[PDB]
Amino acid sequence: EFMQVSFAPLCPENPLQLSRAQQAEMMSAGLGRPQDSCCIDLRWGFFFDGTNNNFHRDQPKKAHSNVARLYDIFEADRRKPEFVGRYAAGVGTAFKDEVGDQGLGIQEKAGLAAGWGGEARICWALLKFLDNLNYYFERIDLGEALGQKDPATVRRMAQDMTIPSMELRKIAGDETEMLRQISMMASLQSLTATALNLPNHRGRRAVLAERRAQLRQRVQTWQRAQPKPKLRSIRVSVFGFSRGAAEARVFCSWLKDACDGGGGELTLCGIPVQLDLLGIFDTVASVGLANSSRLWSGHGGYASEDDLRIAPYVRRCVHLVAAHEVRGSFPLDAAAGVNGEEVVYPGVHSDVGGGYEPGEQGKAFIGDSIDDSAKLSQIALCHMYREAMAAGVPLNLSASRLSKETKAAFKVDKGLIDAFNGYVAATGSIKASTTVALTQAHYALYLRWRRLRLDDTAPDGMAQQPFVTRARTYKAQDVTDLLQTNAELRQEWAALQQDEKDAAYSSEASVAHVLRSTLAPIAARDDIVALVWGEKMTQWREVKPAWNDLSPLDRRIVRLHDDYSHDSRAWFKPFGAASEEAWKRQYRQRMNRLEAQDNAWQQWNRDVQPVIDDAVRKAQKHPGSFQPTPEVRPMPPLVAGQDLKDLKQWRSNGGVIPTEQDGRESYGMFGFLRWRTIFVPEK
């Protein structure tokens, strides 16, 4: 039983069409068998969205993820209560009636920065697991039938919902986030005192055991009253993206807590439970601040190494991973130990899990029109759809309840199919056998694309390409992201070419200056700067051969990166404003303040000017008075420096808000000239 590694297969001409083998698998899964016989199989899907992915918030802009899209088409038919799908919002977004996560304020920042709220979402889905069986019998969830609101129940189950707001403030702070990145990058134990905030394992099990006892009495009552049809089995499938894939894995490990009292094969109220498919997109944990180990590795809180291991009763795991994701905040957690496939896909994190809005960064165009069907992540979506159908998951694209918009989310433009398959064909000779080697080989080709597009005065520069022209028509901030990030890559390379001349660390190294300038908590700790510097130079030497490879790149590879894949380092601004809307709000607030401060000074000037003129005319009339100057009211503070320049421009141009120019991960520590960090399971 093992995870076979490969690159993405060619996308079929109809990506929703099952292969002959997959159509056989679907039939043997039981989907389609009848209730005419004595028995029934319940089929339950659990869908955990990724960081800052929220289905109802993001579907209107067609930016809902591949997890949300598959959930949307899971059967929700009042005539089929045996099929139940449940959706957990991504961390950093609202999940309020479910767990009490408001998705604003410090709760939002802690969820985005550190995965806070993931434990609570797993606990909620474990309650839903019990609710699903009550719903079969009674058409109402069990907590609702008991008058028990889910947030209060989850708070008895989940440590993260008890963390005090002042502690959440610490977890989310800017400087704390710099320290987490340094700890991740340099394998450094925390320099500051931190809290572990481990899961409330005992409370979670205790709550599930009492909830399960309430469930068992009802199930036994209804089975006695009406034993037909017999409940033959419960078939579970679990899907996740990003931190939702870390949650999905830990949910599979903790599913034992919701099933009948331990001892052999999983059952619920005597009914066999089987886990037919774990379908996960690019697993990223990066949770918490520390754990009980020497190396935190992003494996804090619920996301321990032990529980991230694919649970042994997972019958099939399909893990689609992003070949070209390289952000330091998004290390990959590889999956092994069960039957299935780990398949490397082109693009960055949300080119595989979904979630870009069509048109962002000038991608997902058909001619000059924005079109969701041309989004790269549509290919991986259909791959997971075919695997879910083959595993017996009751996704129903034909259901009459479905919206036009819901069904259009599974459309795939033939131009994207051709560009995707051209990429696969151009790289078919690579043939690496592990996920680390396969991703590094495809990232090496990406680096050669970046070098091709590096000189933004030249015809082959990124700035001169059609996708940047399209980005300009879509959103000014996207162009700034793209081109500022290319400028930062020129700086990254120049700093490394300078610093590689001397293998020994110096305080005057270029990269050292970058680190001190961008990482305030360690700017006075030259020894820590030296440690980060040493790892950065090691990473450069790893990728230098690819970056320096000036052999022509296959045209098919260039086209995919120009027109389909996104640049996730470019837009990700953990040290900028919380969002573009927040950036704009803060600029308007700053200008409003500067206007008030200037209107206060100008009004002082007009009150004082007559007094100063009057003292002049008098000294002219009596040049001998020692006319000492008159005292006036205290002068309000002067708008000066950059503040005055911005205010002047703001008045002149009528209120144009400049785009946000920086805020990305430091290129002195992460940047493009590195390999993505990938944790490969213990064996």
Numbering used by the authors: 35 to 717
Question: Can you provide the manuscript's text about this entry?
Answer:
Using biochemical, structural, and physiological analyses, we determined TleB as a phospholipase that mediates interspecies microbial competition in X. oryzae. Here, we demonstrate that the T6SS-secreted phospholipase TleB acts as a cross-kingdom dual-functional effector, mediating both interbacterial competition and host manipulation. T6SS effector TleB functions as a phospholipase with Ser240-Asp280-His347 catalytic triad. It hydrolyzes lecithin, exhibits toxicity to E. coli neutralized by immunity proteins TliA/TliB, and enhances bacterial competition against E. coli and P. syringae.
The structure adopts a shovel-like shape, with overall dimensions of ~120 × 58 × 65 Å. Structural analysis reveals two primary domains: a phospholipase catalytic module and a C-terminal domain. The catalytic module, characterized by about 40% sequence conservation and a low 1.3 Å root-mean-square deviation, adopts a compact α/β mixed hydrolase fold comprising one central β-sheet of 8 β-strands surrounded by 14 α-helices and 2 310-helices. Consistent with other phospholipases (such as Tle1PA and Tle1EAEC), TleB also harbors a highly conserved catalytic triad (Ser240, Asp280, and His347). Conversely, the C-terminal domain with an unknown function diverges more significantly in structure, comprising helices and loops that form a shovel-like shape with the “shovelhead” over the catalytic pocket and “handle” formed by long helices. This crystallographic analysis delineates TleB’s domain architecture, highlighting a conserved phospholipase module and a distinct C-terminal domain. Two TleB mutants, TleBS240A and TleBH347A, were constructed by substituting alanine for the predicted catalytic residues S240 and H347, respectively. Our analysis revealed that while wild-type TleB efficiently hydrolyzed lecithin, its mutants failed to do so, indicative of abolished activity. The detection of enzymatic products (C18H32O2 and C16H32O2) highlights TleB with dual PLA1 and PLA2 phospholipase activities. TleB demonstrated strong affinity for phosphatidylserine (PS), alongside phosphoinositides PI 3-monophosphate (PI3P), PI4P, PI5P, and PI (3, 5)P2, while exhibiting weaker interactions with other lipids like phosphatidic acid (PA) and PI (3,4,5)P3 and PI (4, 5)P2.
